[PDB]
Ligand binder design. Structure first.
Ligand SMILES: O=C(Cc1cccc(Cl)c1)Nc1cncc2c1CCCN2
Ligand SMILES: O=C(Cc1cccc(Cl)c1)Nc1cncc2c1CCCN2
Lengths: 304, 304
């Protein structure tokens, strides 16, 4: 029992982290096979970031201008190319610690672990979610760029995020491993404001199921609702609309607890309308939305 | 910017996790050098746990009864000994992945990362604190025993906890790596109730400093207080008494923000008395106490 914001074990990803320096800029790179992936803004100075023309800036760079260091050893760069907002640096050595891996582009509401790095060295690991406004609420300082987000399925690492920037609002934006940003963000130091950060309803419901499984049941009420009635309330509280796909995904949690999905929706509706009244659920005074239904099943079953 | 409940990168500890089986019981072991450490209740059946005489149960066990598996390979047990509540299984092979390590016994209020494991395989990593009642609020299922808690200082892993049991209240108890339980708990299936789970005041203050550093300042007020006045309020709210040692430890955070420790105490006093009023601090609707002052400085400075 007990329910924690748990990240995947980071060892497989730690073995991929390298330092990439170009000119005066140093950030993190991801070394998989004989390619090092990193944010293309490694070629920029702080001035260049105001209005960068990446193609023009990249013309002035050669393979020997990209310094890649894996631990205390230097890797030889034998090629470089720009794919969207990432640079792919071909090195002459395949990473001996390359795990089985995939590059995936996640949807909003999906969770992943982040291995925060500086100078190619890991500092910490934490769990987060891709927000519905395509930002992440991370913990990143200067030099954290190129730190990655990932999920693990047994021995396969699915890389889904690469850190690129912090918006003026303190929230984070980045790309998938093909270099395409999540959301409308661009790698420029310009006014970029995020849209509404709505709550991931299906995740809140999964976490309510995790609470019941772990014994916190005070919020269970004698009511039920319909998808349309629930969604009227969810719109009012800036919650994402719940669909039949979401109800389907909550099926195993509904079966495990014997609480119909729409009954849990009615409990969530009353929590939104009445508040917590100074009470807590799984040690939280607010409704947690960074656990997917898959995360709840995984944590509650012990998948290694 | 941004502030997350961050765990240490787990790779160094993942390379130490093994499966230990004795009879019908399987749990996790920690393989460091040529010794595998594990909870001594690996020799017990579920019936034995009601009133175990570990010395008597251990007499019936020989080296060949302890099955140790590191990945898909079996380790040869050439000796075994009981040290307090842990078994030390001497194997014929030194762990090639043994990191630089220490065994430390932490004090209540101190935080550490847990690598939750099942069958010697890592499932997740999360950050927790040793509660003032010597319990931990973990996320452990059956088979998680022997999972460890640790801190990392550059390349040295300081192991501080080994998981042993879940109390009837859903909270967790375990030992340091010398086999001594934290708190008054015993490795027996008997009525063991935890004492008052008080809030770690110094950690709440550190987290209030982290909030100011990250821009959440609404709770800062025009008041100050004294240690004795603050402590009268802290007693009323089941908060640990704040000492001059704690004020000293918050010195760097006080200097960074320019907010005197006793001024932050007065802000915390008003938060306790008036509540949050539906507001949040660092995305939390309650006062977080599982970040030490060292954790706040580490996260806010980027120590790798
Ligand atoms: O945001 C940037 C630099 C940057 C500027 C403009 C565009 C792009 Cl793509 C990147 N780096 C960063 C990332 N995460 C966190 C923090 C920083 C620096 C300040 C402290 N925190
Ligand atoms: O508590 C025990 C077994 C046990 C019984 C009595 C004494 C001792 Cl030392 C150990 N194992 C466990 C640990 N953490 C979590 C969960 C379990 C099983 C139930 C599910 N969760």
């Amino acid at each position: 029992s007990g329910f924690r914001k748990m990240a995947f074990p980071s060892g497989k990803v730690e073995g991929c982290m390298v330092q990439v320096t170009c000119g005066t800029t140093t950030l993190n790179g991801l070394w998989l096979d004989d390619v090092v992936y990193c944010p293309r803004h490694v070629i920029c100075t702080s001035e260049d970031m105001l209005n960068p023309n990446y193609e023009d800036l990249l013309i002035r760079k050669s393979n020997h201008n990209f310094l890649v260091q894996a631990g205390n050893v230097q890797l030889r760069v034998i090629g470089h190319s720009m794919q969207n907002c990432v640079l792919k640096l071909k090195v002459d050595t395949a990473n001996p610690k390359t795990p089985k891996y995939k590059f995936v582009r996640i949807q909003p509401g999906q969770t992943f672990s982040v291995l925060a790095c500086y100078n190619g060295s890991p500092s910490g690991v934490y769990q987060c979610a891709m927000r519905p406004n395509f930002t992440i609420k991370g913990s990143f300082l200067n030099g954290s760029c190129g730190s990655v987000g990932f999920n693990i399925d047994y021995d396969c690492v699915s890389f889904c995020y690469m850190h690129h920037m912090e918006l003026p609002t303190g929230v984070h934006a980045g790309t998938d491993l093909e270099g395409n940003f999540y959301g409308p963000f661009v790698d420029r130091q310009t006014a970029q404001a995020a849209g509404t950060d709505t709550t991931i309803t299906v995740n809140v419901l999964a976490w309510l199921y995790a609470a019941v499984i772990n014994g916190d049941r005070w919020f269970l009420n004698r009511f039920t609702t319909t998808l349309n009635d629930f969604n009227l309330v969810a719109m009012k509280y800036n919650y994402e609309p719940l669909t039949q796909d979401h109800v389907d995904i909550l099926g195993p949690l509904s079966a495990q607890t014997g609480i119909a999905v729409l009954d849990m929706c009615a409990s969530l509706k009353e929590l939104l309308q009445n508040g917590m009244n100074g009470r807590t659920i799984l040690g939280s005074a607010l409704l947690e939305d960074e656990f997917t239904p898959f995360d709840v099943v995984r944590q509650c079953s012990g998948v290694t």
